[PDB]
Design a protein around this nucleic acid. Sequence first.
RNA 1: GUGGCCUAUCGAUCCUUUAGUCCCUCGGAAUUUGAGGCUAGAGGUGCCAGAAAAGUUACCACAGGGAUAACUGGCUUGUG
RNA 2: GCCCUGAAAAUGGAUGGCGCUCAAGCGUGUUACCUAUACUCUACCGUCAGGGUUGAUAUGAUGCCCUGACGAGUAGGCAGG
RNA 3: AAAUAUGUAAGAAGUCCUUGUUACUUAAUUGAACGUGGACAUUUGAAUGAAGAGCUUUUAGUGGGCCAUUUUUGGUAAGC
RNA 4: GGAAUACUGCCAGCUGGGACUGAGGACUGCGACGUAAGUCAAGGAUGCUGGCAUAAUGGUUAUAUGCCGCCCGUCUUGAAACACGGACCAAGGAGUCUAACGUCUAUGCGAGUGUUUGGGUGUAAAACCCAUACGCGUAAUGAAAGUGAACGUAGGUUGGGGCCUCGCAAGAGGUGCACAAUCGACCGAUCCUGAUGUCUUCGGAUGGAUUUGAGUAAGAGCAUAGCUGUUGGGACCCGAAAG
RNA 5: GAAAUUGUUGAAAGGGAAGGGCAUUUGAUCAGACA
Lengths: 185, 51, 53, 156, 56, 148
Amino acid sequence: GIDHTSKQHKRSGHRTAPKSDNVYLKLLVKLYTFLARRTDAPFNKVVLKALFLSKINRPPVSVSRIARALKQEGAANKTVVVVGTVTDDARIFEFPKTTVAALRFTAGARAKIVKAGGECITLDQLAVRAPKGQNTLILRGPRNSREAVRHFGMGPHKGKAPRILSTGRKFERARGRRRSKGFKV
Amino acid sequence: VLKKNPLKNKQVLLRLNPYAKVFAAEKLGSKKAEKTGTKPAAVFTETLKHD
Amino acid sequence: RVKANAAKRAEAKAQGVAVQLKRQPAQPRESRIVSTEGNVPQTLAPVPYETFI
Amino acid sequence: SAQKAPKWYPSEDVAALKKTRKAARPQKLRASLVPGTVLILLAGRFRGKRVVYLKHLEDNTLLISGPFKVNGVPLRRVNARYVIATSTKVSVEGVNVEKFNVEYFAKEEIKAERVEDQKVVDKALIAEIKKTPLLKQYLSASFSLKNGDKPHMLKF
Amino acid sequence: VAYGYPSYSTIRQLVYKRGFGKINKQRVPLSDNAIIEANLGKYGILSIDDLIHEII
Amino acid sequence: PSRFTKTRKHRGHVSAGKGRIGKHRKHPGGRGMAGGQHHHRINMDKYHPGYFGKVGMRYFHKQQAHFWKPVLNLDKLWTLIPEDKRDQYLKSASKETAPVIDTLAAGYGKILGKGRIPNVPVIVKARFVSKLAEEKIRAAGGVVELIA
RNA sequence: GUGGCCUAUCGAUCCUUUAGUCCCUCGGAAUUUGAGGCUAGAGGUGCCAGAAAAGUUACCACAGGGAUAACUGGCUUGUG
RNA sequence: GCCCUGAAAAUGGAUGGCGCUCAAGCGUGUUACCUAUACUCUACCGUCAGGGUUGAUAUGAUGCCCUGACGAGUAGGCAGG
RNA sequence: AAAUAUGUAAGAAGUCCUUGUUACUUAAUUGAACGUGGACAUUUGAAUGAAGAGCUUUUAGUGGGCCAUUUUUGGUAAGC
RNA sequence: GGAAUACUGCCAGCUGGGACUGAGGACUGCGACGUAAGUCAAGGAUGCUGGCAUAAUGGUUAUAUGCCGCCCGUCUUGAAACACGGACCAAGGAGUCUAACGUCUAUGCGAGUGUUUGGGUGUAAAACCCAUACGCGUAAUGAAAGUGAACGUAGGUUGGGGCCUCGCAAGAGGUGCACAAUCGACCGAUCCUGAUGUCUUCGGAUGGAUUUGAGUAAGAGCAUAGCUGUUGGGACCCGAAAG
RNA sequence: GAAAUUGUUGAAAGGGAAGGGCAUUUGAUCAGACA
Ligand SMILES: CN[C@@H]1[C@@H](O)[C@@H](O[C@@H]2[C@@H](O)[C@H](O[C@H]3O[C@H](CN)CC[C@H]3N)[C@@H](N)C[C@H]2N)OC[C@]1(C)O
Ligand SMILES: CN[C@@H]1[C@@H](O)[C@@H](O[C@@H]2[C@@H](O)[C@H](O[C@H]3O[C@H](CN)CC[C@H]3N)[C@@H](N)C[C@H]2N)OC[C@]1(C)O
Ligand SMILES: [Mg+2]
Ligand SMILES: [Mg+2]
Ligand SMILES: [Mg+2]
Ligand SMILES: [Mg+2]
Ligand SMILES: [Mg+2]
Ligand SMILES: [Mg+2]
Ligand SMILES: [Mg+2]
Ligand SMILES: [Mg+2]
Ligand SMILES: [Mg+2]
Ligand SMILES: [Mg+2]
Ligand SMILES: [Mg+2]
Ligand SMILES: [Mg+2]
Ligand SMILES: [Mg+2]
Ligand SMILES: [Mg+2]
Ligand SMILES: [Mg+2]
Ligand SMILES: [Mg+2]
Ligand SMILES: [Mg+2]
Ligand SMILES: [Mg+2]
Ligand SMILES: [Mg+2]
Ligand SMILES: [Mg+2]
Ligand SMILES: [Mg+2]
Ligand SMILES: [Mg+2]
Ligand SMILES: [Mg+2]
Ligand SMILES: [Mg+2]
Ligand SMILES: [Mg+2]
Ligand SMILES: [Mg+2]
Ligand SMILES: [Mg+2]
Ligand SMILES: [Mg+2]
Ligand SMILES: [Mg+2]
Ligand SMILES: [Mg+2]
Ligand SMILES: [Mg+2]
Ligand SMILES: [Mg+2]
Ligand SMILES: [Mg+2]
Ligand SMILES: [Mg+2]
Ligand SMILES: [Mg+2]
Ligand SMILES: [Mg+2]
Ligand SMILES: [Mg+2]
Ligand SMILES: [Mg+2]
Ligand SMILES: [Mg+2]
Ligand SMILES: [Mg+2]
Ligand SMILES: [Mg+2]
Ligand SMILES: [Mg+2]
Ligand SMILES: [Mg+2]
Ligand SMILES: [Mg+2]
Ligand SMILES: [Mg+2]
Ligand SMILES: [Mg+2]
Ligand SMILES: [Mg+2]
Ligand SMILES: [Mg+2]
Ligand SMILES: [Mg+2]
Ligand SMILES: [Mg+2]
Ligand SMILES: [Mg+2]
Ligand SMILES: [Mg+2]
Ligand SMILES: [Mg+2]
Ligand SMILES: [Mg+2]
Ligand SMILES: [Mg+2]
Ligand SMILES: [Mg+2]
Ligand SMILES: [Mg+2]
Ligand SMILES: [Mg+2]
Ligand SMILES: [Mg+2]
Ligand SMILES: [Mg+2]
Ligand SMILES: [Mg+2]
Ligand SMILES: [Mg+2]
Ligand SMILES: [Mg+2]
Ligand SMILES: [Mg+2]
Ligand SMILES: [Mg+2]
Ligand SMILES: [Mg+2]
Ligand SMILES: [Mg+2]
Ligand SMILES: [Mg+2]
Ligand SMILES: [Mg+2]
Ligand SMILES: [Mg+2]
Ligand SMILES: [Mg+2]
Ligand SMILES: [Mg+2]
Ligand SMILES: [Mg+2]
Ligand SMILES: [Mg+2]
Ligand SMILES: [Mg+2]
Ligand SMILES: [Mg+2]
Ligand SMILES: [Mg+2]
Ligand SMILES: [Mg+2]
Ligand SMILES: [Mg+2]
Ligand SMILES: [Mg+2]
Ligand SMILES: [Mg+2]
Ligand SMILES: [Mg+2]
Ligand SMILES: [Mg+2]
Ligand SMILES: [Mg+2]
Ligand SMILES: [Mg+2]
Ligand SMILES: [Mg+2]
Ligand SMILES: [Mg+2]
Ligand SMILES: [Mg+2]
Ligand SMILES: [Mg+2]
Ligand SMILES: [Mg+2]
Ligand SMILES: [Mg+2]
Ligand SMILES: [Mg+2]
Ligand SMILES: [Mg+2]
Ligand SMILES: [Mg+2]
Ligand SMILES: [Mg+2]
Ligand SMILES: [Mg+2]
Ligand SMILES: [Mg+2]
Ligand SMILES: [Mg+2]
Ligand SMILES: [Mg+2]
Ligand SMILES: [Mg+2]
Ligand SMILES: [Mg+2]
Ligand SMILES: [Mg+2]
């Protein structure tokens, strides 16, 4: 026997391939696993991983988040990469022309990208263009904008989102929620 | 794939530490030292045989 | 110590390299020769049982 | 079908053996074995026979002869490990012993060449033997462990 | 534990016979000076007897 | 489907996964909301703080839809215009020809100010408005007409 | 100086009842009574995180218990 | 210090047994020796980890490959069957 | 007034120079807090180790314990 | 006076006997010896000889022998227990389905999403199609009347992966999404302030506050499905005395 | 036409249970495998 200084036989808890059975996805993985192995360039290592993430970790990137990213110093002529679907934001008006390499684009998203003179690339097309991933902007979506994470960490004086089906007065607003009944939170 | 022991494999003894070649040559492990004559003061021997 | 290290460092560097500013813990003793001269080993023996109550 | 077929199959190619490094070097016999040392045969057909040792052959065996006229052992191959090397020695300086190699014993009753070759070598020996009394009468008797014999104690 | 003051002889015979390297963990048998230099070469130390030196 | 269920893996295992000491019995808690202010109290406070007591005015025979006032901000507001006729109006910001956006026809009861429309003047027919909402409108040259 | 030198001398929800602005609401529109809200106290749960509560059973009953009494047995040996 | 006495209980009985007296008993010193699922070493099974592997002209890319460390388990969790 | 145990520190979020902001502070740009700009990074400031570090959700069983050595309460004591 | 020897330690000094192992499968590596050509014990066994190919060698099984081995299940601190159930065998026999929900995952679409109440249609419980609504989401806050989200590139500061620029490199700078800490701004509630005006009591401009919300701050959801978990149900299966 | 359980027949073994584990003798039995 040994004095074990770490838990034995413990998996890394990092995904290896995705859990998706979409075949075309598995190929997109096959490209970048090959790319990542042979490239030495980090952009491919990141994209390899970001292909595995669950739907929850591929939070939708809006077309307006894409507009503002390009407004950074020197970022407007870069091609923006989104590993996941890209959606449409009616709330912008002037939209730039660029090239967006994504998994998926909601209709409006490509329509708005295109109608500004832009380009919609699927990530394998970006691969041939930018094999080292040169001149790319990776844009991550709002992970914690999720409804579910409102309720995480509920507790006294924690101010987070009670789990409550129907909401109104006389739905969990009384004793414990205000000084005048009992106490407050 | 099979760890050869130096110290019994002259081939792997000399695959590290080539000085072993020379070492064996001058024998170096039997090296005699120049015999000197130094003697301790009688103090040292007096207190050594003390009670 | 910090302030000492700046003054140790600047004086060192503008003199030259060789700064030692990390703290080393207490090291083993270095070799020495204790002189017998006018110091002759005192022979002691364990002592017998006594009472004196 | 009764069973689905494997998606993979081992290649029925046989591979090449890696190039081994074991170089057969000539054996060294224990120093106890001097041509003309009487041997005690420990096993096999003539086990117990006391025998005379002539050559160290090329398969590492030991050429011995009884002599035939004495104890009935012919010129024969014997394995060094199955023999006890005794301390009594007859002079084979001046016994041919050139003729006998491995191939001499290729198996393919007695070829008369052997009959005459036995005769020349034995005649050589038996002459040297009578130089030292009883030694023929020794070589004729078989070896045996008497009660009380301690082979780890015994000087042979 | 039991411990004490290893003479050169045993330090050598330790490392020679039972000395192994940590390389990405892995416990690599030493067996070639090229291994030591690949890792402890950055410190000097391109040989096993260079290692034994930095120990004793 | 039952073949993926874990009660299959628990075949042979004697306690079903429910423990040898703790068993699985009828209702260790009581049933449902029992013990709300007594033994299950530490849960119902946190988790659902405020679940107990009374809070506000009673409304007898309240009907929803007296209160129907669906909201739209200037966040969009142009999305009311079909996408084709939209671009015609963006360029050609003008008085005397101004898009007429009837918000109640779109299903909206009051217009809010989430903010930043374009400088096009727009004629917005609404039921109610935020002050800031209607201010951003006039600041860009439109007007608001109240309707019913 | 935001009670008693410091370390103890205390109390949810429902209800009621005071005090507060002159504030919200009775939903077809008003005025006035009356009623309902908001905030801050009081009325009390001492089993003190806070049920509304007498016995008897040798006429008896059920779920259990060696988590627990009445004998042996065991440790103990004050006591004898 | 060892030895005797002090020293009374219930089936027949226990230095584990037989027996042991310059011990096979008490104290102590020195050695050789015996054998654990432990330790060193090899093989094999699995688990985890880190490496290498794109295509062509072959067939499992979940694939193949080199390498290291690890393996107790009720209640219980997951996994592959 | 010990031993064992126990708090904090051992640098880049550090050290130092110049001098903006302010409704707070001083008699007083005096302070206080936050900075712009500037000098110093080979031992960037003890030892040893590290199958790395950080982080989140979700749910099981459990919620009778018992024992050894040491500290120790009640008990003559106890396999209490 | 001069030796030897003990004792301890070292040698990349030589060497004899016995045991177990032989993993790998062209090549490549590090070496070693020799002027050499080559040779080797140097990244894992080869060589020579004999036998049985019949019944050698193996597996299975009964027995015997050495040494070991208490009844299972259970509840329990503790069971082989002088704790319970269990003579034996077959067959049956226990965490389901449903309504509603939490986390995670896969899928379609995405500021939206849900054809299946119903209609159309049909090769007729299928498949295929659809108009209006509706549901959930896209606004919050307040008991309520009610008001309702940009000072600013939708802010500042410190970290950030990635990308960009200089450098052979070491390294320097640039932008920095997600995420984390902090100081701010916005919306509602609360408390102050109370301008322009007025059907003299309406109106609430403007600037504030150790207050406060399940908010805003370039949307993330809707729907199907899966494991697991929740709750109501006969609710894992069998069981009261009662009413 | 299973099992418990039963008769006959054959085989083997049994000094206060029976059955079990590592190992081998002995018997019975079954291959594969040489070429
Ligand atoms: C943990 N696995 C171990 C495995 O390591 C191995 O253990 C052996 C052990 O059986 C041997 O022991 C065996 O042979 C001895 C004679 N040489 C006598 C005792 C016998 N058990 C030991 N000599 C060495 C261990 N590694 O064999 C037993 C095991 C349980 O499979
Ligand atoms: C299957 N037949 C068995 C037969 O094989 C035999 O079984 C013996 C049994 O008698 C022995 O039992 C007895 O005899 C031994 C020798 N005297 C000493 C131990 C004792 N229990 C066991 N140790 C071994 C079994 N196979 O005797 C019992 C039986 C049922 O007749
Ligand atoms: Mg182990
Ligand atoms: Mg994975
Ligand atoms: Mg809502
Ligand atoms: Mg040796
Ligand atoms: Mg110092
Ligand atoms: Mg080789
Ligand atoms: Mg289901
Ligand atoms: Mg299954
Ligand atoms: Mg299981
Ligand atoms: Mg289990
Ligand atoms: Mg069972
Ligand atoms: Mg369970
Ligand atoms: Mg149970
Ligand atoms: Mg319990
Ligand atoms: Mg339970
Ligand atoms: Mg209570
Ligand atoms: Mg309302
Ligand atoms: Mg409202
Ligand atoms: Mg209208
Ligand atoms: Mg409509
Ligand atoms: Mg004061
Ligand atoms: Mg006070
Ligand atoms: Mg006083
Ligand atoms: Mg005082
Ligand atoms: Mg009160
Ligand atoms: Mg009442
Ligand atoms: Mg009241
Ligand atoms: Mg007021
Ligand atoms: Mg009203
Ligand atoms: Mg009415
Ligand atoms: Mg009204
Ligand atoms: Mg009133
Ligand atoms: Mg009361
Ligand atoms: Mg109580
Ligand atoms: Mg209590
Ligand atoms: Mg009571
Ligand atoms: Mg009664
Ligand atoms: Mg009576
Ligand atoms: Mg009566
Ligand atoms: Mg007594
Ligand atoms: Mg007494
Ligand atoms: Mg004994
Ligand atoms: Mg004696
Ligand atoms: Mg003894
Ligand atoms: Mg004994
Ligand atoms: Mg003794
Ligand atoms: Mg010995
Ligand atoms: Mg791998
Ligand atoms: Mg492996
Ligand atoms: Mg395990
Ligand atoms: Mg698992
Ligand atoms: Mg399997
Ligand atoms: Mg300290
Ligand atoms: Mg340190
Ligand atoms: Mg860790
Ligand atoms: Mg849990
Ligand atoms: Mg639980
Ligand atoms: Mg619990
Ligand atoms: Mg207990
Ligand atoms: Mg005791
Ligand atoms: Mg002398
Ligand atoms: Mg010696
Ligand atoms: Mg040897
Ligand atoms: Mg061998
Ligand atoms: Mg082999
Ligand atoms: Mg040979
Ligand atoms: Mg052969
Ligand atoms: Mg042959
Ligand atoms: Mg057997
Ligand atoms: Mg039989
Ligand atoms: Mg048997
Ligand atoms: Mg036994
Ligand atoms: Mg039980
Ligand atoms: Mg019990
Ligand atoms: Mg009990
Ligand atoms: Mg107890
Ligand atoms: Mg039991
Ligand atoms: Mg008992
Ligand atoms: Mg009994
Ligand atoms: Mg029971
Ligand atoms: Mg029983
Ligand atoms: Mg029974
Ligand atoms: Mg029964
Ligand atoms: Mg899951
Ligand atoms: Mg229909
Ligand atoms: Mg219609
Ligand atoms: Mg809708
Ligand atoms: Mg009103
Ligand atoms: Mg940088
Ligand atoms: Mg506010
Ligand atoms: Mg404010
Ligand atoms: Mg504040
Ligand atoms: Mg599953
Ligand atoms: Mg249920
Ligand atoms: Mg009743
Ligand atoms: Mg029939
Ligand atoms: Mg039968
Ligand atoms: Mg019979
Ligand atoms: Mg009998
Ligand atoms: Mg009898
Ligand atoms: Mg009898
Ligand atoms: Mg028995």
